[model samples]
Target chain A: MILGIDIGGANTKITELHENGEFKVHHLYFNNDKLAEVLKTYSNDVSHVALVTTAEEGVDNILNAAESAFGSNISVFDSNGNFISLESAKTNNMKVSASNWCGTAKWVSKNIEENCILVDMGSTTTDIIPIVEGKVVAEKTDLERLMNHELLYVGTLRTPISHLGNTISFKGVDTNVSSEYFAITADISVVLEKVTTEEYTCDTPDGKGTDKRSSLVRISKVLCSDLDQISEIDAENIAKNYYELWKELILENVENVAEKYGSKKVVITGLGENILKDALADFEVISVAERYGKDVSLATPSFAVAELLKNELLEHHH
Target chain B: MILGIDIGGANTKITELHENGEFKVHHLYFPMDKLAEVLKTYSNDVSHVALVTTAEEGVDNILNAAESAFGSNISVFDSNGNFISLESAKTNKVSASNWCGTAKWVSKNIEENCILVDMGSTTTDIIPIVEGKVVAEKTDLERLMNHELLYVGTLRTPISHLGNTISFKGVDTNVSSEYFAITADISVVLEKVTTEEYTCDTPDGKGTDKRSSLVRISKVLCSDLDQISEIDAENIAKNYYELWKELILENVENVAEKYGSKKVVITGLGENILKDALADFEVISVAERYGKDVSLATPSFAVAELLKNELLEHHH
Candidate 1:
């Protein structure tokens, strides 16, 4: 039995794969302290465990928390797709931002495509990972990757709608949008029918919740107006315009990373839904949702870690 | 003797002017419970007081707070620039007519063909005067429509509202939408405002020191010193401040192009925003003419002066 644990700030994904390649994935909102609590939900027959995180918490803290939770040695993965002990992962700060894109890239580079760009379009940020001939060649750190346009501060849910651009073409007028934190990408998603009200998972700016009317009100406030101030139709148009602008931004950043790596294909995953597929229509797009289904695509890091650790243990024994 | 009381939600300004031209000003933050307690501190010889506010309280509620504050009935100024009884003000819901009092005094006692860019705590009022009368919109709703009232202000306005993006390291980066910092944080970073003048609430409830301010501004980029150097943080503040300057400049030009006025009169805490301002307009600091004390309390001083005339004319 091999278990892969992918812990994030707001969420954690736990994947358990039996020896027959059958796996069960559980994704839930749990903190660092509850690692032991989360582990209890599974059976006690686990033989191997691997973990990864792209959260802001320290690696040393996460490793200690997991070791104390499992009461056994846990393996960790790095950006190079290699498994190392927990201490070595903490010794180098560069090795820890791995579990998110690295594990996904490893899974795709080995099983899917040798040469491709892995575009993990999450809610708060986007990762345009370049995998050339089954090799991870992108910049390792976020600062350097941001410099090279491989990392963009954009995503589907967490991005504020105002950050898409300062001004949107409002009813044939180039009006400046309000600079207040009036609305975000989730509001745009809810308004445009990209995500249902139930799918809007983040805390809303207004605390008014995820109803369509509520989203339209928040979007209207972005223009320094209320629903009474601007018509409902106009507010919806504003929401659509912001989404359109965001698509351009995502397309350009992916294009920059793809052109540099000379990869014509992209493995699209994360919570991006169909937008990434449409945004990069020119490239050969591979949907994780199509291949592995939604639950595995959303929790790819843990699933990938489970697969990697399974192979590692079997090869060593043989 | 006449007194001008500019009571806002955050802070209240009091101006005392006597018959001999000797005057004084006091500005402080007083809660609703302390308003009457503070009002009693003014001179007993002060026969009249004119009051105004652009706050988010009811006119009736403020009137009750005022009536209890003063033993005598206090007059309120309407947007028409006329002194109306408290009952009349309560019935009409006349607020943010505060700009009307300042412009009334400026057009009559000071500049003719004036454009007053009064950047108060929470909003900026661009008042255009045509011959001694204010031709600008009287209501906040209408003023916003005319581009004469910008929602962003000096101290309290969240800096994110200034712009959605900023240039850092020659690349435009998206700013954090969280209210991590405000324009006051920007002002402190650029030394645009003095430490003593940044009296509004800090974004993170921290100190107004440049070090604390740097923490707030860096968070505006979804970053901090751990990720970037001290100089990198300072550069982010400078870049954000530059965008703030551009926003106000464009609004200034918007009001100027509409009103056709070259002489710009600036006052309140954010007067410095316009002092180093547009090239086409003749910038006049209210501090230079009326002194800094009166400049900070311009709206209160105007209402006090107006009350003096109103009281003198009625008593005779």
Candidate 2:
């Protein structure tokens, strides 16, 4: 049996993957609120464990609760029973080593074979990688200057229209101008109809997550005169302009990482992969969804990595 | 001998133009206590003369004084001299034809061809016509609609740097935002080292003219940020954004009128060209100068048209 425990700042998720591949999942919300009750739930039988924490300070609480519940007799180990050590968690060498996995792994695999570019456009940032040998690479994470360098600062949720220098001439007059601080990327993305409410993940600067068409129109009006000031066609065109500018920023970053990794095959993923594919015409890009069997779920990065680890364990055991 | 007189709303200019084109120029200021004494110096002996009064209602007073000093030997004509009969200032068809020549002749002779676009930067209004022709053409003026419709509004100007969505990254991040409006085109244009004293003009919203670098920067700062908040860099950018929105509204009105005029030429004259060009005409435009031939030697438009009749002896 394999035990997976994901601890967050105030929430905890515990799942048990059986030898037969059947998993049972349980969740404990606000672990801090019901700490005493939570400590009594863990039994003495959890085996071959894997642990991850989202909170900056969640590991201490989980260990405290585990110690209280199991009394000092139980210990956690990797799927192979390798006695997982704290030193393995001391540094996220994996995270740091493959920050550019999308580019590095994809390219390294591409040199020997061919695949597609995979771009994982997330809420705060985009991680673009290439896919070939069925594994993301480890070379992209090597940046000497962490503070002074970032791939780029544009994301679907974090970008704003005003930053694009949008302007409008109503009737024959030019009246609408965007402020760099006042407008965000969502303002333009919402109008493009590229991402629906289901796809939107960023919080609005104004704290409102309006996904209705009416709300989109209302926001679109800010960059124009009254509804009549700009024709519907022009409004769409202007919105497209904003979208293109933001996408261009992302693509430039993607190109830079790709050139460094020297990838030829491109496999695109992420929530914004379609938009990214539309932006980059020279590459062959698809989603992580296409490369999976019924038993091999690639629904999310977490599940993909988990399954990959499980398959590796079975092969090693055999 | 030729005499050139330019009349403005506030002042009158009198110049004796020699046959060779050399001239002696003098200013006749209005609303001053010594106004009457200043009118005594002109002699009526010179012909080919033009005197234009730019005062709103002081035309007759100016003519009467000139007639009294020079007598009947010197011909006298007022701004309306072409339209009205000498005795009754009566209206007539003969005068109607003369009307066509009298009102625009002075300005027409000042510059034979080109257009005249004038307005303070904060607000712009333009008047354009054929160089020597009297009628207005729809296509001719309408072509300038686009040039007139740019959106650099001036109620306040927002500099691109202080914008909240600035394009800075790790390469740069500290934005010098000011609380006051800094997007005023006049401010940025004047700040450029190539700009000279004459290139500097007053901004529309600020209501003051500037000719130096220190004045340019100081003027762009908020006039009253001290009483409320410190005039920081961000506030200046904010105010500029507000003004930019205001000017864009003005450009829309200018752009919608481009039809009928086939060729609209935008003329960038004076310091305020950017502000007035907000009206996006079909072929909107402005001019460096209205040219010399059509501009009346008179102080104002009304006087220029009037002089066309009196000087040429062509009764309108």
Candidate 3:
């Protein structure tokens, strides 16, 4: 079996593919030490390991744990989308930073024949990657991608609603929003029924439950109001307003990447893509889960690194 | 002898003009109870008192103390520029709020040919005197109606109200109107006003020293000392100073157009700051006419002293 791991700031995913086509995936929240224990659990089962991480503080801990578990049998992914050993990854820190987005683009380019755009809307950010003629044709640096909107800092779950603007319209009057972190975009996802209580795996503002009622109270505080100040329907409208904002942000970035690449095809993957399904109507949208399995789509970066490693090992044998 | 008393929000002034033409003035910061003690110190010498107050709190305390010390021979100036009995002033609160601006124009006795702008820490009162008379159609209501009595002042007015937008070498930024710091910060940072002269409470509720004042002003745009260089923050302060100058000029134009006078007589403690802002017009500082001590005292109190002397002559 070959193991693949993707570590993010708040969440981590582990995937394994056996030689006989058996697959398994697990997603969980992790700290610096918890990731090592997770790697140790599958230590004796896998023959080779491929890993990529976006976590800064816990990268060395994961590397030490992975090296001790898999020894020299592990391949680490760099920011430039190159697969290198653990020794090479430590020498160039920029390599790990450039690693994550490239995995998704490399996977799509290898599998898909047409020119396309890969949009991965995670909890806190959206990565808009462009592929032209099975080649990754996008900005290499994160700063350039951010300026181009190919790296939108907004996301579906963790973004604070106040980041949208200061004043919003309510009952035909322009009202100011409170300059505090009173609500998150997950509440909007809940208000729109795009995500359920179990679906939003992020922290809440008031540390209450993520039920529809809890989400309503959290969103109302954005306008410096309570439930008594606004109706339930009014809260829903506010959520719709934020939902439209998130949609506009994603839609604009997608258009920018698509226009630059001259590609009309979009391969949408990640848990947050449910919000984009309707807005991406003009383009031919490919649901990664529909093509691959649901687990593979959720852990798309891990699956990409695993496949890339498998192909490299096979080419070496040839 | 008559004692002319002017009580402000931050400090109080007591001036005594004896029958022998001996003029003595005392300026001190008084709390609610301190004014009465200051009154008792002068209780034995004075026979009558004329008082004007801008202090909303403890005005009654001061009045009661004065009535006890000077008996019934006391006159209180009202916001409407009238001298009424303490009983009448107690009955009408509007009398107390209207007292400050009329004194300077009344004291100058210039016959209304020029406008008098009494600029204080937190508010500016523009009383246009026309034809040797205070022809200002507005009292406080009418003065504020034409922006003649603007809430813009040098010391305690927040910088947020000075301008809606400002441009630096970086992106021209829209400032947040969050009452972070008063225009005193800008004036201090630009060296237009001094640290010792800053009388009002600071926005940060800390010391009014120069370093603290700069920190408070930088905070208006949500900036700190480390985030912005000193040169950049000073540049922003200069921009705010220009904005405040424009506001003063607008009010000047309004008074000049109404009264047909380009010459302006400036009074109050903020005269130097206002002088720099209104440098273009035929400017007259009250310090030039009266000494600096009498100029800093509320001009209305001087007007009340002049009125008392005129009344004594009439009785003789």
Candidate 4:
């Protein structure tokens, strides 16, 4: 059995690509000591383990904890998409920023033999990588990608309303938006009922509940007004405006990446793929879940690393 | 004695032009109750009180408080630079933004006939007064045409708005014009600002001390100590300082040509910065003639004293 573990700041996902050609996935909230317990159920017959982590501070401890559960046949994925042994990853002085898109792009490049763009829209940011002839042709470094508009630092949940623009119009009069974090992007979607309350994984700006009424009140506060000040329909219009702003932000990065690479097809992944479906309707959109499976789509980086490792081992045996 | 009161958001200044040609000025923190107490000290035989306030809220309360203390000889200066009664000021709904420039012009009229330019921390106000007459054709409407009010200030403006093209080691690089606090940083780096010269808030949402200020200035082009060198940031600021000088020079040329003059009188706290930019013009520092505090407070004092003389002449 080949195991893949994707450790993030919030949640940890484990995918087991068994020798029987079956994929089993498990998810658990992130805990420092619970890694071994979570992996122990599948550790009885595991052979190789591939790990990708967004953890910054205690990677060595997490890896050591993983090593205790499984054996020393572990490969760690870095920001450059190359898999290194546990020892090399511990000592390398590279400023390893979270490059989860590297594994996703590597998987797409291996499966699809055509020119395409891989777009991963997560909760906090979006990553657009260009693929040419089954190779990752986009900028590898985070700095270059940010400059090229390939890494857009905005998403459907955490983006503040103040970041949309400095001003907002109410009743045909332009007024300045409050600088305070009165509302976030999650509130916009929640007020519009585009996303359910359970879909909003991020905390509310006011630390209140994420009900429809609560989200509406928060959105109204972005204009420095309260629920009593503005009607419910008026608040919904504000949310609609911000929802369009989010679409425009995505369109901006997508157009930049497409123009640069001259790619026609776009492969969408992550939980925010639904948002891209409408915005990218003009292009040939390929959903990763539709090609693969929903479990593989949700735990993409882990599944990609596992399949890549499995293929490497089979080629070595041949 | 006639008192001229100029009430600003942060501060209130009282200029009491005495009957025997004596000038007494007092600067106080903004408080309506405190104004009555301050006036009561010299309120023995007060004849008239002229006022100009930039405070939007509680003008009636402040005026009523002044009336109770100094009797009913109070006249409020409107935006048109005229002395109107308190009722006229309340009913006309006149904006008080033009009061400072009006006072400055009226003060310059008492001294000499010249184009007056007061370059403060955030904005520069250029008023052309010819032969004891305020000759600027614009009040607040066409001030843009004559360059009467230029938003370019010496200290508080964002340096990113100055220009998009910048130099890094003699090579031109396109800078991101983000709203980072670059202008005040340039002033601090050049050592042109005094201890209390910074009137604007810091852009970094941090304290405006020397070290915090250096870090704030360095991030103008979205750079920090980790990405670029401190020396490079300082040099970039030096280049921005040049850009600011060019802005001031442009405005000075525009305002001067409108009145057809190569000479002008410069006042306000930022007189030195303005004087440096206007090296081609014969710039006269109002501080040299009227003393530092008096020059800074010329408009409030001049308007009050000038209005008092008019009231006295009318009485005669």
Candidate 5:
């Protein structure tokens, strides 16, 4: 049995696959520095392992620790574990590579259509990809830019409240913006119903849990510049203001990617893909999970690569 | 030629040492995805190449594209670069090898002094070694009990803004507490003599070129929760209050480590260190700049490690 691990900055997913087709999936916080605990969280029956961490340079110590902890019986690999020895993880099909889930849309769509834009809106950023001819035309990591023009920095949950730019004009009145630096895009998204406070309220960017209504109330209060001075009416408007900013950043990538690759259909995924899905009312918006009828979120976008690889390995030598 | 590149989360530094004894240093910004223009800026004169990006994974292709734009001679190393390997860029150092800064500190201090704490106060974080041992030592990137609490998230600036916890003496007042975060420590120190503004704000953390007159006012503006009318006061306090939480969470490791390494004397260095750690170094204050009175700010810390490594490499 070989274990496939997709380690993201925010979350970690472990995929256990056996020769007999036995598979188990586990997800946890992506604290790469804590690999000791990470490896222990898995089933003891598992031995072999292949791993890829989203954090820069995290894979090394993690794999080393896992190997040391579990013994040489286990071997961990990168996202494209097949290419663990390849000089470059970048591949010919790019789409065929078992790396990021955004790249895996190819596998999810393999039984069906091919030419489509994979739009994944996650907790922080959005990725729009144009897959062509069975290969990811743009680089898997750079699809946001080289393939699509989506900016990587914008996100719904962790963005600083200060970056949204305060004083959104409502009814021709200039509203003051809050100086609170800890405010995030989710605070506004919740009020607008673009996302719920429940889903939006996770841990603050610093990892403080958002369980208190007072915390949400404080965050909402800071969504606008005025403390008590700004009314909830303005707070709601402030949410609209943030929405415009979010739309501009997202649309810029969408339009640029569409113009660059002539991608027509939008395959929406990710936690925040609904934000983009709501705006693309006129376009061909296809949900990869909904279209394929599978649980996509259980695995990171990169897990698609794992799924595809498992299938390819099964077919090989058969 | 062996190259040493320190790619911080904010800035990138490239140092090349020739066969003889000459060196050239290049620094720039590489923000992974959105640094197209920033990467172009480094397209100056390049003869040979070695790259090590400290940012998280998923930047390999982008780095490759950027390196390709420079020339075909460039090779990228993910974490430790040539020190590890090129195939997978994944080398685990979970055994607490001697290469880590803290491990080196353990070796060196055993030869010299023992009780010492290293406060990085930057992206990499500081490692404190007390009594020739790391008790509350940790490598986790988050704050929790039992971990080395070294969250000096801010480099240099005013301290009162580090946190805003509700503290009460007699009544349930919404006052900010120093026990919870970094703000209390900073507010007490930092030679606040009152000029136009602080000209020497560090690039990382809460350091800013401009100082808000209102920030000073907010430090003193804590009231009861029932006084719901203190909107501006609450807003100003909350604004800084929001930032203070991060400062505490960030330093949780350092805090844990400091408390864990009980018998260590604090060695103060750097611009902000003098202000932040010096006053607190009453019982723990031991050496001035590793006992040599050297500056750990510029070429000090990294250079010190370089010297230690050179000695170790030569001896081995």
Candidate 6:
């Protein structure tokens, strides 16, 4: 059995893949002690353990933390395209800085379509990673990815309401939304029921409720008005408008990347890819949830690295 | 000479209007009992005095602290748009009564039915007057919720208060939500205000020069001049400015639609920007009617001028 843990800036996802191919996925909100307990819990049944992260912390603390978690040796995925020992990961810092995307994309190229665009739309960013001939061919750094359309910063949650545009249509007139942090796309998502109250993991703008009504109030405030002043109808309408405009925006960027890569196939995964899946239907879309279970699909990178580590260990015959 | 004192949070403005139609505008950055001493310095020929403030002190404290400096009859402007005697104006009914000073004056001089946008360095007071009546919310708590008291000022507003995500280049990027800079930096970087015009302290406590403002703006984008091009910094700076401007413009539209007014009367430090933001409406600049210095310090100047009229009309 192999345990692959993918720790992002906000959360941690783990997969315990047995030799028989059955696996269980666990998601956590990233407390180091909780992660240590999770590692100890799964270590009893798992042989290989590895991690892929975009964490800015140096490998020293990471390896030190891992060593303290369990005496069992651990490994990490580096930008050099293969898994390396935790100690070696500590040796080379920059290479292991931010290659978790490759860990996700390499798994797609190895198991799924070789030449496809992997659109991983998470809570904070949507990455348009192009897989070319069994290699993850995307910009390596965030800045470069932002310069290209490979990374769209607006996402399912944290994007501010003002980012959709400078102005939106209120009634018949072109009206401007309040250009403050009065609301967010998470409020819109909750209002439109694109996500349930539980799906809204981020803090509400007003630090209030995540119910539809509360979300509507927050959205109404984007017009710098109370619910009585602007009403919920316009609030919901603005959410619909914002979601539409956001999809159009996603479509445009996905088209830019798809056209540039000349790939008609897209492997869409992540908890928030449903927002962009419909937008990218012009291409052949493969939902990770269809083949893998929904949890595995959401924890795609974690499971993928587990499977990758299993293969890497098998290749080193006795 | 009659003196008008407007004590705001960030800056205080004083206008010394002579009985013969000459006045000096003094916009000081700091003080308190210092206000009393400063007022006495202008008491060479000054006889009458009045004040309006959005300061931390209550109306009573303001009058008590400054009234004994000169033998002149000192008064405080209230939310009722009148200059009441200091002894009678102890109630906080006039604490944030500064907006009516501009609105009442504008309604009398400019138009009866119009919106008053008095943009100081700390807040923008959008006072709506319908049919020569001040139809604005009297309390700050009420007005802030009603979108009448928008905190997007020209100098002191934090850049993070504007918005998070910006369309930098072709992609929308979420800028770092740090108070690394302020609206004053944007105004300076955009050339809307000269470096000398940015009177507030920089967020980084750096220079108020354009280059320094550019660096602070780059920090808002989560990078610095070394990583971000000067051109990119300019784009982000303008994006912050536009976002805040849109908020003010949108609120203005809502207020106008709600109050049934198409005319906008502008005053205070942001009068020039207000003229452009409210370009859709008939904008009557207080500066055009008065002078640039008077418009910059319109709240105090309005109080002085209004008290002048009442005193001369009843007693002179």
Candidate 1 segments exceeding 4 Å error: A18-22, A31-73, A79-81, A87-99, A311-318, B33-57, B69-73, B131-133, B137-146, B156-165, B173-179, B220-227, B309-316
For this target, which candidate reaches the highest DockQ against the unseen true structure?
1
Error of 1 at B272 (Å): 2.3
Instruction: Score each candidate by Cα lDDT.
Output: 0.73, 0.39, 0.66, 0.66, 0.42, 0.72
User: Stretches of candidate 3 above 4 Å error?
Assistant: A31-58, A88-94, A167-169, A172-176, B1-316
Task: Tell me the chain A TM-score of model 4.
Answer: 0.88
* TM-score for each candidate, following the candidate numbering: 0.84, 0.41, 0.53, 0.62, 0.43, 0.72
> What DockQ, between 0 and 1, does each candidate earn?
0.23, 0.05, 0.05, 0.08, 0.01, 0.17
DockQ of 1: 0.23
lDDT (Cα, tens digit) per residue for candidate 2, span A128-201: 54444555433232121111122333456665454444343433443344342444555566667776666555
Query: Model 4: per-residue lDDT, tens digit, A86-139?
Result: 666633434333466877788788875358888887776678889888888877
Q: How far is A281's C-alpha from truth in model 2 (Å)?
A: 5.0
Candidate 4: where are CA atoms >4 Å away?
Answer: A1-3, A10-31, A34-36, A44-58, A69-71, A88-97, A112-114, A167-183, A199-231, A289-303, B1-40, B43-223, B229-316
Worst 10-residue lDDT window, candidate 1 chain A: A43-52
| Chain B TM, cand. 3 | 0.82
lDDT of 4 at A150: 69
Q: How are the candidates ranked when ordered by DockQ, highest leading? A: 1, 6, 4, 3, 2, 5
Once fitted onto the true fold, the runs of candidate 5 whose alpha carbons sit more than 4 angstroms away are: A1-3, A16-24, A30-58, A65-82, A85-113, A140-150, A161-167, A172-182, A194-227, A289-295, B1-316
What fraction of native interface contacts is shared by candidate 6? 0.07
Task: Name every residue pair that clashes in candidate 6.
Answer: none
The most accurate candidate by lDDT is 1
Misplaced by over 4 Å in model 2 are A1-84, A87-118, A129-150, A164-176, A180-183, A187-189, A198-201, A205-209, A212-224, A231-233, A292-301, A308-312, B1-316
Candidate 1, B1-316: lDDT as tens digits: 5667776655677787867888889877744445555546644423222335442345566566666676445777765667776667656635656577889888877787978888876677787887877889755545655667776677877665666556778875555556688888878877878888788788788899888998888777666789888788888877776776777778778878887888888887777776764445788788888898987888889887777766667897
Task: Using TM-score, give the best candidate's number.
Answer: 1
The sequence of per-residue lDDT tens digits that candidate 3 reaches over residues A208-304 is: 8899989999888766466885798887888887677668757877887788768898998777778767667788999887877778878888887
For A1-318, candidate 1 gives per-residue lDDT tens digits of 567878665676788887675788887764564655466454432222233444344665666677666655567776567777666544455655563687878878887899999988777777888999998787766655666667776777777776677667778655555656678888888888887777788888878868988989988877667789678999999988888888898888888888887899999888885778878888888898898888887888888777777776677789
Interface RMSD of each: 3.6, 9.8, 10.6, 8.6, 21.4, 5.8
